């Protein structure tokens, strides 16, 4: 029922080759070391992986730990920013928590809402993983949100990404510092994402 979808999360952008055991061990350890659990023991009960679409559903033992796990949206796992989302069929019942109450230091959200400070970064080498692209962008300070767009068929980046800095006032310096930058065989395009949005 609805309680059960209130204990499940979509986890996108899972690395190639990840087993159920590896995902379980990662999420259980990180939730406990991050203080996101509410009771003794492991909070994740099951993982179902779809290797063809690089997503998993995790099932948790409680509604509140499911909600807290949303604070791991963007956590890096084997170089890739995991996308943590509510199931499409999820609807909170009255009294059910909806938003995580904790911020996990170092975790950069994958949700980049349109805004005056949202950047588009194009022309990235397709072999750079999420962490490596973030590393480049953090030359100008910490990120508030970031997503690298992937190719479903090749299991690899499409060469473009979106981001926003914690300090919105560095946006034009980052454009100036990165736009036209020669990176491997390509030259970066960095501009506000509203310039070229379809």
UniProtKB/Swiss-Prot annotation:
PTM sites of type Phosphoserine: 152
Subcellular location: Nucleus
Domain RRM: 7-89, 117-195
5-hydroxylysine: residues carrying this PTM: 134
Coiled coil residues, start to end: none
Impact noted for substituting residue 7 to W: In DEVDFB; likely pathogenic
SUBUNIT field: Interacts with U2AF1L4. Heterodimer with U2AF1. Binds unphosphorylated SF1. Interacts with SCAF11 and SNW1. Interacts with ZRSR2/U2AF1-RS2. Interacts with RBM17. Interacts with PRPF19; the interaction is direct. Interacts with POLR2A (via the C-terminal domain); recruits PRPF19 and the Prp19 complex to the pre-mRNA. Interacts with KHDC4 (Isoform 2). Interacts with ZRSR2. Interacts with the SF3B complex composed of SF3B1, SF3B2, SF3B3, SF3B4, SF3B5, SF3B6 and PHF5A.
Entry's family note: Belongs to the splicing factor SR family.
Function in brief: Plays a role in pre-mRNA splicing and 3'-end processing. By recruiting PRPF19 and the PRP19C/Prp19 complex/NTC/Nineteen complex to the RNA polymerase II C-terminal domain (CTD), and thereby pre-mRNA, may couple transcription to splicing. Induces cardiac troponin-T (TNNT2) pre-mRNA exon inclusion in muscle. Regulates the TNNT2 exon 5 inclusion through competition with MBNL1. Binds preferentially to a single-stranded structure within the polypyrimidine tract of TNNT2 intron 4 during spliceosome assembly.
Disease annotated for this entry: Developmental delay, dysmorphic facies, and brain anomalies: An autosomal dominant disorder characterized by global developmental delay with intellectual disability and speech delay, epilepsy, hypotonia, short stature, microcephaly, intermittent exotropia, and non-specific facial dysmorphism. Brain imaging shows a thin corpus callosum and/or delayed myelination.
Entry protein name: Splicing factor U2AF 65 kDa subunit
Organism taxonomic ancestry: Eukaryota, Metazoa, Chordata, Craniata, Vertebrata
Span within the parent record: 143 to 340 of 475
């Amino acid at each position: 029922q609805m309680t059960r979808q209130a204990r499940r999360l979509y986890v996108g952008n899972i690395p190639f080759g990840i087993t159920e055991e590896a995902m379980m061990d990662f999420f259980n350890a990180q939730m406990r070391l991050g203080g996101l659990t509410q009771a003794p023991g492991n909070p994740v009960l099951a993982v179902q992986i779809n290797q063809d679409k690089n997503f998993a559903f995790l099932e948790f033992r409680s509604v509140d730990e499911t909600t807290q796990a949303m604070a791991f949206d963007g956590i890096i796992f084997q170089g890739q920013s995991l996308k943590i989302r509510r199931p499409h069929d999820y609807q909170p019942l009255p009294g059910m928590s909806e938003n995580p109450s904790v911020y996990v230091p170092g975790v950069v959200s994958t949700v980049v809402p349109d805004s005056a400070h949202k950047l588009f970064i194009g022309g990235l080498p397709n072999y750079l993983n999420d962490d490596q692209v973030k590393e480049l962008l953090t030359s100008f300070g910490p990120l508030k949100a970031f997503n690298l767009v992937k190719d479903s068929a090749t299991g690899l980046s499409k060469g473009y990404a979106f981001c926003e800095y914690v300090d919105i006032n560095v946006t034009d310096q980052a454009i100036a510092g990165l736009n036209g930058m020669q990176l491997g065989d390509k030259k970066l395009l960095v501009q506000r994402a509203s310039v070229g949005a379809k």
